[PDB]
Structures are given as structure tokens and as C-alpha cells.
């Protein structure tokens, strides 16, 4: 059966995700007591050429460079180039599939250099400053960014205070940004999909359903405490509420414009004018808003409102 194989996959990914996070968080939180010393740094090379080259490569971090960038990293003394390396990392445009590599590299930095985490945090904050008054949203980057700062917290590079606080901040903006126009929906879904388990305490309907139906035991939430998760869950439901309002409105005004085309069908006979390419745009984005609403109701384990 197809349904069982998908559930086994979900279940397998869940555990891979969980085991990795647990392993990385342990190393990162334990980093301070065993960073290397002066003498060790002496034997790595501080050349400006190589360290600068490396900082540049960090602008295009890619999964298939995991080993190559790691190899270079281990030979360089990056003591003086933290701020620059942090800047490359924050600006770099990562695909969904590249974020784990970036986090891996961030962990090698963090585990070697005390200056890394404070710089990374500080530069992320500035970066969300620059965004707030620059106009034309760049949602593609904010999507990944949110996931990225999420992992960096889960993985213990940022402390709960620093990282949770930073994520809460950026989520608030999305909630406030998206009350009529729900333009960041895919950003909230991605965040939920990837990090909602540990940051928001999410347990989606699919996971619940798979667990009961196939007697699969899914990973426990053990990273962020339920108290710290609650605020995040509240925001998501409140967003979801807002999104369901916007779904109802657009249902009415789709069918108040279908049941208006019935008057303009009878009276003065049809004419598939520009209205026959305006309905093809109202019902395009509705279909996508319905898809995203279903997608997020599941992640949050909420029912969909009923659509006559």
C-alpha cells in the first residue's frame, strides 16, 4: 500500500531530524569547556589570502561542499575573520536543501571560536533592521532565514533566550504584516514544516494519524520546554485564525461574483469579456489560499471551517 510507505518515510525523516538536532545541540552547548588554545591556533594558517578566499566561499554555501568547506575550515586560523565570515553566512542565499550544511559549518565555527555566536546573533539582528525599512519584501530569503535562525537555536548555537526571542520577534511581524493580505503564508508553513515540532510544540494531524494507524512511535519533543513553546503556538493559531477569516471572505466574494454572473448571464447574454479572465484570477489565488489553509490546519491539527 502507498499510504503505509509514505508514513514510514515521514517517520524516518522525523527521527533523522531528531537524532541530528539532539547530537548537534549536545556538542554546541558543551563547546565552551573545550575550545582549542593559542598553541593549536599557531599551527593553523592565518594567511589573508586563504582566509579571505574562504570567507568568500561562505557566501554560496552548498550541500555538496559540506566536506570541501569543512576541509578548508580545519586548516585556517579564522580568529581575525569572524565578523566577515558571519556576514557571508547571513547574506548567503541558501536553498531549502542547503540549510543543514550551513548549520554544520556554523557549528564548527561555534565550537572553535567564542566570538562566533554573539557576532552571528548581532548580525542577524542588524539584518532584520535593514529589512524593516527597505521596501519590496524579499520573502524567498526571509523564508529560509526564519528556518535558519530556528535551527541555529534548536542546535544550541544560540541560547534559548537569544534565539527564541529573535524568532518570536520576526514571527510577530508576519502576523501583523498578514491580516488582510496573507503574503507570508508559505513562510509560516515552511517554518512550521521544518521547525514547528521543536519550537512551537507542533504535532501535525498527519503524524498523529500515521502513529495511530500504523503503530509508529514518533520522536519526543525534548529540546524546547512546553512553556517556551506556548507563545509560538499561540502566534501560529492566531495567524491561522486570521488566515481562515481571509479564506471565508474570499469564499463569499467568489460566490457572490458567481451568483452575480448569473444575472449578467441572463440579462444581456453572457459576453465572456475581461470578466472571463478575472474569475480565472480570483479562483486561481483562492485555490492556492485553500491549499495553504489546508496545509497549515494539518500542521496545527486544526479543523477547516466549512465552505457551503
What is the distance between the alpha carbons of residues 201 and 229, in angstroms, rounded to a whole number? 6
Nine-digit cell string for 123 = 548580525
Method: X-ray
Using DSSP's 3-state secondary structure scheme, residue 76 falls into strand
Phi, psi at residue 72, to the nearest 5°? -60, -50
Class of domain 2-308: mainly alpha
**In Å, what resolution does this model reach?**
2.6
- State the distance between the two ends of the chain, measured CA to CA, in whole angstroms: 33
Angle at 223 between CA 233 and CA 228, to 5 degrees: 40
- Domain-wise residue ranges, the chain: 2-308
C-alpha dist (Å) from residue 81 to 113, 116, 235: 11, 10, 38
What is the distance between the alpha carbons of residues 256 and 170, in angstroms, rounded to a whole number? 36
Phi, psi at residue 76, to the nearest 5°? -95, 145
What is the distance between the alpha carbons of residues 233 and 246, in angstroms, rounded to a whole number? 20
Phi, psi at residue 305, to the nearest 5°? -65, 160
* CA-based nearest residue to 87, from 63, 116, 64, 114: 116
Helix runs in the chain, H state only = 2-29, 38-42, 48-57, 66-75, 82-91, 99-112, 116-133, 139-154, 160-177, 185-199, 205-214, 226-255, 263-266, 279-299
Using DSSP's 3-state secondary structure scheme, residue 195 falls into helix
Amino acid at each position: 500500500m502507498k499510504e503505509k510507505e509514505e508514513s514510514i518515510q515521514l517517520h524516518q525523516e522525523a527521527w533523522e531530524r531528531h537524532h541530528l538536532r539532539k547530537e548537534l545541540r549536545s556538542k554546541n552547548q558543551n563547546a565552551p569547556d573545550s575550545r582549542p588554545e593559542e598553541n593549536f591556533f599557531s599551527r593553523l594558517d592565518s594567511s589573508i589570502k586563504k582566509n579571505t578566499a574562504f570567507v568568500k566561499k561562505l557566501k554560496t554555501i552548498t550541500e555538496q561542499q559540506r566536506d570541501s568547506l569543512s576541509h578548508d575550515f580545519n586548516g585556517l586560523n579564522l580568529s581575525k575573520y569572524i565578523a566577515e565570515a558571519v556576514a557571508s553566512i547571513v547574506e548567503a542565499k541558501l536553498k531549502i536543501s542547503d540549510v543543514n550544511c550551513a548549520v554544520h559549518l556554523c557549528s564548527l565555527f561555534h565550537q572553535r571560536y567564542a566570538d562566533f555566536a554573539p557576532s552571528l546573533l548581532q548580525v542577524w539582528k542588524k539584518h532584520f533592521e535593514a529589512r524593516k525599512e527597505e521596501k519590496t519584501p524579499n520573502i524567498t530569503k526571509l523564508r529560509t532565514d526564519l528556518r535558519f535562525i530556528a535551527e541555529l537555536t534548536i542546535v544550541g548555537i544560540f541560547t534559548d533566550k537569544e534565539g527564541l526571542s529573535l524568532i518570536y520577534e520576526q514571527l510577530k511581524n508576519i502576523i501583523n504584516a498578514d491580516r488582510e493580505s496573507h503574503t507570508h503564508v508559505s513562510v509560516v508553513i515552511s517554518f512550521c514544516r521544518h521547525c514547528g515540532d521543536d519550537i512551537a510544540g507542533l504535532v501535525p494531524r498527519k503524524v498523529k494519524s500515521a502513529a495511530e494507524k500504523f503503530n509508529l512511535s514518533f520522536p519526543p519533543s525534548e529540546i524546547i520546554s512546553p512553556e517556551k513553546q506556548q507563545p509560538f503556538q499561540n502566534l501560529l493559531k492566531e495567524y491561522f485564525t486570521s488566515l481562515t477569516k481571509h479564506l471565508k471572505r474570499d469564499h463569499r466574494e467568489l460566490q457572490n461574483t458567481e451568483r452575480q454572473n448569473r444575472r449578467i448571464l441572463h440579462s444581456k447574454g453572457e459576453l465572456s469579456e475581461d470578466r472571463h479572465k478575472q474569475y480565472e484570477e480570483f479562483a486561481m489565488s483562492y485555490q492556492k489560499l485553500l491549499a495553504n489553509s489546508q496545509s497549515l490546519a494539518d500542521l496545527l491539527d486544526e479543523n477547516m471551517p466549512d465552505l457551503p
